[PDB]
Structures are given as C-alpha cells and as structure tokens.
Amino acid sequence: ESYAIYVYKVLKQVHPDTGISSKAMSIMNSFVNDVFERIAGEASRLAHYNKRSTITSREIQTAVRLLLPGELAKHAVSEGTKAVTKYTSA
Amino acid sequence: SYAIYVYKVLKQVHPDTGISSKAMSIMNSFVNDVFERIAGEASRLAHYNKRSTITSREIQTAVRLLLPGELAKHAVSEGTKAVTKYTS
Amino acid sequence: TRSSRAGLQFPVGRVHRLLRKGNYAERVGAGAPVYLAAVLEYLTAEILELAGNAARDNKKTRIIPRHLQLAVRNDEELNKLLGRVTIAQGGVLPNIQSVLLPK
Amino acid sequence: TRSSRAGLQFPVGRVHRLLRKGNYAERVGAGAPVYLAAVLEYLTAEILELAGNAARDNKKTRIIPRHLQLAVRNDEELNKLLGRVTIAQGGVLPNIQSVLLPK
Amino acid sequence: RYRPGTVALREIRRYQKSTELLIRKLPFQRLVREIAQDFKTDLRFQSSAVMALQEASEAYLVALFEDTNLCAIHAKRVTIMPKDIQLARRIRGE
Amino acid sequence: RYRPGTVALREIRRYQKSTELLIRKLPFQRLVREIAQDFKTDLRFQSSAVMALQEASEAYLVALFEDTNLCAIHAKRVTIMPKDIQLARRIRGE
Amino acid sequence: PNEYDLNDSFLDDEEEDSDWEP
Amino acid sequence: PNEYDLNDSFLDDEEEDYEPTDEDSDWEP
Amino acid sequence: IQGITKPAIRRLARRGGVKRISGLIYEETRGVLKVFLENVIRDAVTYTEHAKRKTVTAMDVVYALKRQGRTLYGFG
Amino acid sequence: IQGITKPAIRRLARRGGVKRISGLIYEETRGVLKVFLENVIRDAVTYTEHAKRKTVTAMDVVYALKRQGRTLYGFG
Ligand SMILES: [Cl-]
C-alpha cells in the first residue's frame, strides 16, 4: 500500500539527477499495488487449480508469463530467478 | 458438482421437463462461475474492511455489486430469507 | 440437513467447505454459505424457468444447450450477467439487421 | 536485510507480509516474495527509465504524471499491460489521424 | 479569413498537449451531487472522491471520442455524429 | 436468375437456427496441431480440448462478424470488407 | 465424415447428447 | 475561479481544516 | 446535466483528436456521461454503505471503477 | 491455415448475420483466427506445463479462455 521510498530508490539508480513529483509518486504506488494484486491473484489461482496449498516462486513465475506481455515477461522472469539465486549465494 | 441440485430445482420449476447431459454441464459451469464471482468479491470486501471473516453481509454486498438490477433485488431477498429461516 | 434447515435444495454444507478451502478469508461465518447457496439456487431457477419455456416453445420436452442460450439472450438481465460467457452448442439468437431485409 | 541479500531496493519482507495477509494461499514459499519483489522492482525501473527519458527529452528535471503516461503509451508492451488503466493527469499521447492533416 | 480546419487542428494540438481537467470543476461537482443525492438523500462525498470521478469520467469521454472519431472516418466523414458514438459504444460492449 | 441477396438471407436464416460447429472438425484439428506442435514438439491435446478450442474459436469469429457487419452497415454498405474487421477489432481492443 | 481423427498421435484421450438422470 | 466549492454541504472532507490545493510538488524522502 | 457545457465537451473531443463536431453531439455526450456516472456512483455508494459510512471516499470510487474494469491510478 | 475454407468462413459470417462478403475477407479471417488460436494455446500450454503435464486438457483450455476474459461453459 505504500512503496514510495523504494520507488525513489529505484529512480535514483536509473536517473540519478531526475526527481519525481508527488502526484507521479501516487501513480507509481497505484501501479505497484495493481501489478502485485494481479500476480498474487493469478499465483493463487494456479495453486488452487493444482490442489496445492502454497504459493512458491514457481507460481509467481507462471503468473508472470501469463500476465506480462512478451519481452517484459522474459526480462521479469530473468530478474526474478536471478534474485532468488543471489539471495542464497556466497 | 451441482448436477443433482440443478435437477432438483428443474423439477420444481418445470416438473415435466428433462435436461440433456451437455446442458447439465452448462449449468454446472454456470453455478461455479457465479460462485467464484461472488466469493471473490466477498473476499475483496472483507479485505477492504480489514475483516477476517466473510459473513452473510459480504455475500449480500457482492450480490449487489455483481448482479444486475432486478436479479440482485430478488437474490438478496432470497438470501436474507434463507438466513433468517436458518436461524430458528 | 443444514440445507433443509434454510429451506434450500442447494447444499449449504458443501458451499461452506468450498468457501473455506478457497482462499477467500481466514474464517467463514455460518450465514455466508446459506446466503450464497440461496443465491445460486435462485439464479439456477431463473435460468431453468426461462430455458424450459424456450424448450416448450419449440415443442421440446428436454432442455439442451440451445434453450439455455435462447433463455439467456432474450432476458435483458441474464444477458448482462452472462454477457462475457460462451455457451457451447448454444448458437446465436436469430436476428437480421433490418437494413438487410426487403423494405 | 532480505532485500539486500537479493540485490533489491524493493522490500522483500513487506511483500512476504502482504502475500500472507491477502489470503492468497495457506503458505508462502521462501523464494516467492524474493521473486515477486524482484519483478515489481523490474517493472518499476522500466517505467521510471522510460519516464525519465520523456522528462529529459522535454528538458525537464522532474517526472510528473504526464511523463509516466507518455512512457507507458509509447512502449508497446507496457501499453498492453496497463491497457485498462487511467493515469490521472496523464493526458493523451499526441496523435492526429493522418486523414485530418493537410495533404 | 475563416479556415476552420486550421482552427480545429490548433485546438487538437493544444488539448492533446495539456493534461488539465477540461470540464469546469463546479458544474462537475453539481452533477455528481444530483446523481449521488438521487441515490441516497443524505450521502456526501470527499472532494478527492469527486476529483477521482472527474479524472475517470473525462478519461472515459476522451477515449470514447477517439473511437467515435474512427467510426466517422470509417464512414469517410470528418464530422462526428451521434451514430458514431453509438457504434463505438455498441462494439465496446456498453 | 441471379438472386445473391435472396441466397444470402436464406443462408443467414439456416445458420442462425443451427448450432452445429461450422468449420469441419479434422481441418480444425490439424490447425490446432500445427500451432501446438510449434510451441512444443511433443505436446498432445485431449480431443475435448480440441473441441473446447473449436467452440470458443467459432463463437469468437461469429461475434466478430456481427461487429464487422455493424461497421459495414455504418458505412452504408452491405458487403463486409477487411477495414470493417479491422475497425471492429480496434474498438474491441485487439 | 466430419469428425475428429482419434488415431492422430497428437491426441491423447487416456484420461478422457443423452438425457441426464440421477 | 475554477475550483470545487468546498462550502457545499454535500462535501465532507476528512481533514476538513485545510483546503486542498491542486499543485504538484517534489516528492522527497 | 446542462452544466456540462458545449465548450467543455468540444475540448474533450479535441483531446480525442476530433476535427469537426455535429451539433447533435453535445446532448448525446451528456447522456453518455450521465450513464457512466450513475453506474460508478451506484457501486461507490454500495461500498460506502457496506462499510456503514455515509461519506463516499476516493477509495470507494477507486473500487467502484475497478469493479467496472476501469482501474484508476493516482488516488490510493 | 488454408484448411479453414471459404465455405466454412462464409458459414460463420452467415451465422453472424452478414449478407455479402468481399473476397478479401477470407484471408483476413484466417489471420485473425490464427492470432486468436495462438494466444489461447500459448496460455493453455503454460497451464499444462506449470502442472508438469504434456497433454493439454479441456480444463487447461477453459482456464486459458477465462484468463483472456472469454468464459466458456460446458467443459468443467
Ligand atoms: Cl489550507
């Protein structure tokens, strides 16, 4: 429900010298909440279809391929898998 | 599935009418579809209101959100009537 | 039975468990499946009433997909409820744009 | 933190929390909130990158809703993803049908 | 000199460039008030809720006019007409 | 005597009273097989999955043709053309 | 004969209009 | 002046001390 | 509903790229806007009433719009 | 794709109420039908593979359709 500080952190990585307005930060927060609910929603559907009790990264991955178009999905899946790997690597 | 209960309702409304087997599958999809639309919105309403329990109140408001006009009016009356009869 | 206690033919106990096993909330109060079952039974009776009519209007004794589809698309409100639904083997409602018919 | 170990700016703990609280499943897999957080950051970075381009293509130092709208509507894939979305104060992508322009 | 197409084209560029609300705010509020109070007599709105409705409503209208424009062009016209709105809405599902 | 309009109306009446699938089943099956085996080589379908696909596909095309007809009539034609299919799809959001 | 060809190795019906009766 | 009429009894603002303004502002941490 | 003026509707059509507008468009547009607002406000009120409140919030309107497939960003 | 013949396409247009059909319609319909079929099959395969199966079921097709807002009745 509010991700603004994180949105700002990402902004500073892709556009260090660019700021964001408060109205535009509201848009981004709605966006992150929207995309979260879509993915979590489909991941819950998938688990339910498969008589499974748990949302794992597999269900997030499949939900991403179903919901994102084309190359957004491939880059999303690559970003997601990479992050799970780094999470528990030396 | 719901076929038996569909058939029981068919015999109340049209006692001399049968239903083909592929029409019963239609009706079964219909029931599950409507179930999922109401229960989904009921869950949405409860989460919006920081409520942990889905009650008859969440079902009712979802029926108001998802059914058109007169269908909603009667669905609500049927549901409220069933609940009060249940509590006796 | 819980259903007969609410006056329903649709199964209240079965609606309760599906509500619980279905990831909707962490608890489901007792009145919820009664109310939901009543609504599914009502909507079922609506469809079946109108579809039985379309069956007898074609001198049929049995409801087939075509009659459900005729019932749905002739009733303004079931048509809105089922506006994004494909009934297999339902066909279309017979209708020709007036401009295509001899004046 | 969990987000540090994942190389992410987005809060992995919060995402995990919201997965449990939104009644999506009985259970969350350890990888799930890392994966989802990474995807949400990726999508946020995509929009912010393109929106910052539109802001800077206009010699502007700040992103406003207009720039998020320009960025989304000019990227074929974001435009599809946000197809049913209204960005308040975004206006429209400037575009006049060719038939309305002087030959 | 008249040149209405030049005038129209300049107006398209002007309003496609801006993001401001184009319906004046007080008339919009008063329209929301009448519909709302016709539903429930004692109902009130937050001002942010009226503005959410106005953003949503204008965006809906603009998008409708885009489709309406294409319907008129389809019929080889530059003037949009009620039947173009009606066609767009019919195919849109409304 | 050539009565294309009368033959057209009779066909409209015949296929609107009918519910049979109108694309022959074996050709539809091979088309699904061609597309499916392009995604994954060893993929198989159930026959009822092919039929589900066929019901959904025919219903989609029939409804698209309905919107297409409205587009053509809108331009004061009874003959549907590709620009009609394309206008319908654009306003539909495809 | 307008039917599906079930001998197609692309079809796999291992796992899978009359009056309905209880 | 093209504003909403906040004296309308139909408007019930939650804050209802301050007047809303339409201006954007820099978002900072 | 007559408060939604002809200039206002014309400006909306401009942003939509419309080069010329028939005089009959304005009344038509007013009917369409009324239907849209009735539909959204009805669902908004339903959310507000479910919550036993009597003031509709931006969130209620945001939810009403979502239930009708018109997700709005900027008011959450 | 050419196995979807002119008469089959004509029949669907007839059920759609179409009175006359340009010769250019047939190739346009084949393109549209193929885009529709690829979009639904892609999603049904994703469901099938997610479940670690290699036979697409009718249920898998039902879920693909519903994912795309095209609810189909009669297959579960
Ligand atoms: Cl103030």
JSON list of N, CA and C in Angstrom, two decimals, chain F residues 24-26 29 32-33 36-37 43-47 50-51 54, chain G residues 1-16:
[
{"chain": "F", "resi": 24, "resn": "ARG", "atom": "N", "xyz": [-15.15, -27.65, -40.47]},
{"chain": "F", "resi": 24, "resn": "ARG", "atom": "CA", "xyz": [-15.03, -29.10, -40.42]},
{"chain": "F", "resi": 24, "resn": "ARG", "atom": "C", "xyz": [-13.98, -29.51, -39.39]},
{"chain": "F", "resi": 25, "resn": "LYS", "atom": "N", "xyz": [-14.25, -30.61, -38.69]},
{"chain": "F", "resi": 25, "resn": "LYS", "atom": "CA", "xyz": [-13.53, -30.92, -37.46]},
{"chain": "F", "resi": 25, "resn": "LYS", "atom": "C", "xyz": [-12.08, -31.34, -37.73]},
{"chain": "F", "resi": 26, "resn": "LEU", "atom": "N", "xyz": [-11.85, -32.23, -38.68]},
{"chain": "F", "resi": 26, "resn": "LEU", "atom": "CA", "xyz": [-10.48, -32.64, -38.97]},
{"chain": "F", "resi": 26, "resn": "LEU", "atom": "C", "xyz": [-9.59, -31.47, -39.38]},
{"chain": "F", "resi": 29, "resn": "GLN", "atom": "N", "xyz": [-8.69, -29.60, -36.35]},
{"chain": "F", "resi": 29, "resn": "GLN", "atom": "CA", "xyz": [-7.79, -30.38, -35.51]},
{"chain": "F", "resi": 29, "resn": "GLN", "atom": "C", "xyz": [-6.35, -30.22, -35.97]},
{"chain": "F", "resi": 32, "resn": "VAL", "atom": "N", "xyz": [-5.00, -26.75, -35.00]},
{"chain": "F", "resi": 32, "resn": "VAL", "atom": "CA", "xyz": [-4.57, -26.72, -33.61]},
{"chain": "F", "resi": 32, "resn": "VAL", "atom": "C", "xyz": [-3.28, -27.51, -33.45]},
{"chain": "F", "resi": 33, "resn": "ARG", "atom": "N", "xyz": [-3.17, -28.63, -34.16]},
{"chain": "F", "resi": 33, "resn": "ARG", "atom": "CA", "xyz": [-1.96, -29.43, -34.06]},
{"chain": "F", "resi": 33, "resn": "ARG", "atom": "C", "xyz": [-0.76, -28.67, -34.61]},
{"chain": "F", "resi": 36, "resn": "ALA", "atom": "N", "xyz": [0.04, -25.92, -31.99]},
{"chain": "F", "resi": 36, "resn": "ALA", "atom": "CA", "xyz": [0.50, -26.51, -30.74]},
{"chain": "F", "resi": 36, "resn": "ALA", "atom": "C", "xyz": [1.90, -27.10, -30.88]},
{"chain": "F", "resi": 37, "resn": "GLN", "atom": "N", "xyz": [2.14, -27.85, -31.96]},
{"chain": "F", "resi": 37, "resn": "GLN", "atom": "CA", "xyz": [3.43, -28.51, -32.11]},
{"chain": "F", "resi": 37, "resn": "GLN", "atom": "C", "xyz": [4.53, -27.52, -32.45]},
{"chain": "F", "resi": 43, "resn": "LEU", "atom": "N", "xyz": [4.01, -31.95, -27.48]},
{"chain": "F", "resi": 43, "resn": "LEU", "atom": "CA", "xyz": [2.77, -31.62, -26.82]},
{"chain": "F", "resi": 43, "resn": "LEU", "atom": "C", "xyz": [1.61, -32.40, -27.42]},
{"chain": "F", "resi": 44, "resn": "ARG", "atom": "N", "xyz": [0.70, -32.84, -26.56]},
{"chain": "F", "resi": 44, "resn": "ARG", "atom": "CA", "xyz": [-0.50, -33.50, -27.03]},
{"chain": "F", "resi": 44, "resn": "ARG", "atom": "C", "xyz": [-1.72, -32.80, -26.46]},
{"chain": "F", "resi": 45, "resn": "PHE", "atom": "N", "xyz": [-2.85, -32.98, -27.14]},
{"chain": "F", "resi": 45, "resn": "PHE", "atom": "CA", "xyz": [-4.15, -32.49, -26.67]},
{"chain": "F", "resi": 45, "resn": "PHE", "atom": "C", "xyz": [-5.09, -33.66, -26.42]},
{"chain": "F", "resi": 46, "resn": "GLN", "atom": "N", "xyz": [-6.02, -33.47, -25.49]},
{"chain": "F", "resi": 46, "resn": "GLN", "atom": "CA", "xyz": [-7.22, -34.30, -25.48]},
{"chain": "F", "resi": 46, "resn": "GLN", "atom": "C", "xyz": [-8.13, -33.84, -26.61]},
{"chain": "F", "resi": 47, "resn": "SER", "atom": "N", "xyz": [-8.95, -34.78, -27.12]},
{"chain": "F", "resi": 47, "resn": "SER", "atom": "CA", "xyz": [-9.91, -34.40, -28.15]},
{"chain": "F", "resi": 47, "resn": "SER", "atom": "C", "xyz": [-10.92, -33.39, -27.63]},
{"chain": "F", "resi": 50, "resn": "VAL", "atom": "N", "xyz": [-9.56, -30.02, -27.97]},
{"chain": "F", "resi": 50, "resn": "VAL", "atom": "CA", "xyz": [-9.66, -29.50, -29.32]},
{"chain": "F", "resi": 50, "resn": "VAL", "atom": "C", "xyz": [-11.05, -28.95, -29.56]},
{"chain": "F", "resi": 51, "resn": "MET", "atom": "N", "xyz": [-12.07, -29.67, -29.09]},
{"chain": "F", "resi": 51, "resn": "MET", "atom": "CA", "xyz": [-13.45, -29.22, -29.25]},
{"chain": "F", "resi": 51, "resn": "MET", "atom": "C", "xyz": [-13.72, -27.95, -28.45]},
{"chain": "F", "resi": 54, "resn": "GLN", "atom": "N", "xyz": [-12.52, -25.30, -30.31]},
{"chain": "F", "resi": 54, "resn": "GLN", "atom": "CA", "xyz": [-13.29, -25.02, -31.52]},
{"chain": "F", "resi": 54, "resn": "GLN", "atom": "C", "xyz": [-14.55, -24.23, -31.20]},
{"chain": "G", "resi": 1, "resn": "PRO", "atom": "N", "xyz": [-17.01, -37.88, -43.86]},
{"chain": "G", "resi": 1, "resn": "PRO", "atom": "CA", "xyz": [-17.31, -37.97, -42.42]},
{"chain": "G", "resi": 1, "resn": "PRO", "atom": "C", "xyz": [-16.64, -36.84, -41.62]},
{"chain": "G", "resi": 2, "resn": "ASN", "atom": "N", "xyz": [-17.43, -35.94, -41.05]},
{"chain": "G", "resi": 2, "resn": "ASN", "atom": "CA", "xyz": [-16.90, -34.74, -40.39]},
{"chain": "G", "resi": 2, "resn": "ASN", "atom": "C", "xyz": [-16.75, -34.99, -38.90]},
{"chain": "G", "resi": 3, "resn": "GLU", "atom": "N", "xyz": [-15.62, -35.59, -38.53]},
{"chain": "G", "resi": 3, "resn": "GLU", "atom": "CA", "xyz": [-15.31, -35.94, -37.16]},
{"chain": "G", "resi": 3, "resn": "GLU", "atom": "C", "xyz": [-13.83, -35.70, -36.92]},
{"chain": "G", "resi": 4, "resn": "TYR", "atom": "N", "xyz": [-13.43, -35.74, -35.65]},
{"chain": "G", "resi": 4, "resn": "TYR", "atom": "CA", "xyz": [-12.02, -35.67, -35.29]},
{"chain": "G", "resi": 4, "resn": "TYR", "atom": "C", "xyz": [-11.37, -37.03, -35.50]},
{"chain": "G", "resi": 5, "resn": "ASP", "atom": "N", "xyz": [-10.09, -37.01, -35.89]},
{"chain": "G", "resi": 5, "resn": "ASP", "atom": "CA", "xyz": [-9.34, -38.24, -36.12]},
{"chain": "G", "resi": 5, "resn": "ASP", "atom": "C", "xyz": [-8.64, -38.63, -34.83]},
{"chain": "G", "resi": 6, "resn": "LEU", "atom": "N", "xyz": [-9.14, -39.68, -34.18]},
{"chain": "G", "resi": 6, "resn": "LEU", "atom": "CA", "xyz": [-8.61, -40.04, -32.88]},
{"chain": "G", "resi": 6, "resn": "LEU", "atom": "C", "xyz": [-7.34, -40.88, -32.97]},
{"chain": "G", "resi": 7, "resn": "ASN", "atom": "N", "xyz": [-7.01, -41.39, -34.15]},
{"chain": "G", "resi": 7, "resn": "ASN", "atom": "CA", "xyz": [-5.75, -42.11, -34.30]},
{"chain": "G", "resi": 7, "resn": "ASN", "atom": "C", "xyz": [-4.57, -41.17, -34.45]},
{"chain": "G", "resi": 8, "resn": "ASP", "atom": "N", "xyz": [-4.84, -39.87, -34.50]},
{"chain": "G", "resi": 8, "resn": "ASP", "atom": "CA", "xyz": [-3.76, -38.90, -34.51]},
{"chain": "G", "resi": 8, "resn": "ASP", "atom": "C", "xyz": [-2.93, -39.07, -33.24]},
{"chain": "G", "resi": 9, "resn": "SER", "atom": "N", "xyz": [-1.63, -39.31, -33.42]},
{"chain": "G", "resi": 9, "resn": "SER", "atom": "CA", "xyz": [-0.73, -39.37, -32.28]},
{"chain": "G", "resi": 9, "resn": "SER", "atom": "C", "xyz": [-0.64, -38.05, -31.54]},
{"chain": "G", "resi": 10, "resn": "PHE", "atom": "N", "xyz": [-1.16, -36.97, -32.12]},
{"chain": "G", "resi": 10, "resn": "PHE", "atom": "CA", "xyz": [-1.25, -35.69, -31.40]},
{"chain": "G", "resi": 10, "resn": "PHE", "atom": "C", "xyz": [-2.35, -35.70, -30.34]},
{"chain": "G", "resi": 11, "resn": "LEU", "atom": "N", "xyz": [-3.36, -36.56, -30.48]},
{"chain": "G", "resi": 11, "resn": "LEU", "atom": "CA", "xyz": [-4.42, -36.69, -29.49]},
{"chain": "G", "resi": 11, "resn": "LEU", "atom": "C", "xyz": [-4.05, -37.74, -28.45]},
{"chain": "G", "resi": 12, "resn": "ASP", "atom": "N", "xyz": [-4.40, -37.44, -27.20]},
{"chain": "G", "resi": 12, "resn": "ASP", "atom": "CA", "xyz": [-4.11, -38.30, -26.04]},
{"chain": "G", "resi": 12, "resn": "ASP", "atom": "C", "xyz": [-5.37, -38.30, -25.17]},
{"chain": "G", "resi": 13, "resn": "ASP", "atom": "N", "xyz": [-6.24, -39.28, -25.41]},
{"chain": "G", "resi": 13, "resn": "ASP", "atom": "CA", "xyz": [-7.52, -39.39, -24.70]},
{"chain": "G", "resi": 13, "resn": "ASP", "atom": "C", "xyz": [-7.48, -40.48, -23.64]},
{"chain": "G", "resi": 14, "resn": "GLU", "atom": "N", "xyz": [-6.33, -40.67, -22.99]},
{"chain": "G", "resi": 14, "resn": "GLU", "atom": "CA", "xyz": [-6.24, -41.68, -21.94]},
{"chain": "G", "resi": 14, "resn": "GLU", "atom": "C", "xyz": [-7.11, -41.30, -20.75]},
{"chain": "G", "resi": 15, "resn": "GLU", "atom": "N", "xyz": [-6.96, -40.06, -20.25]},
{"chain": "G", "resi": 15, "resn": "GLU", "atom": "CA", "xyz": [-7.69, -39.62, -19.07]},
{"chain": "G", "resi": 15, "resn": "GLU", "atom": "C", "xyz": [-9.16, -39.34, -19.37]},
{"chain": "G", "resi": 16, "resn": "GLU", "atom": "N", "xyz": [-9.49, -38.98, -20.61]},
{"chain": "G", "resi": 16, "resn": "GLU", "atom": "CA", "xyz": [-10.88, -38.78, -21.01]},
{"chain": "G", "resi": 16, "resn": "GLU", "atom": "C", "xyz": [-11.18, -39.46, -22.33]}
]
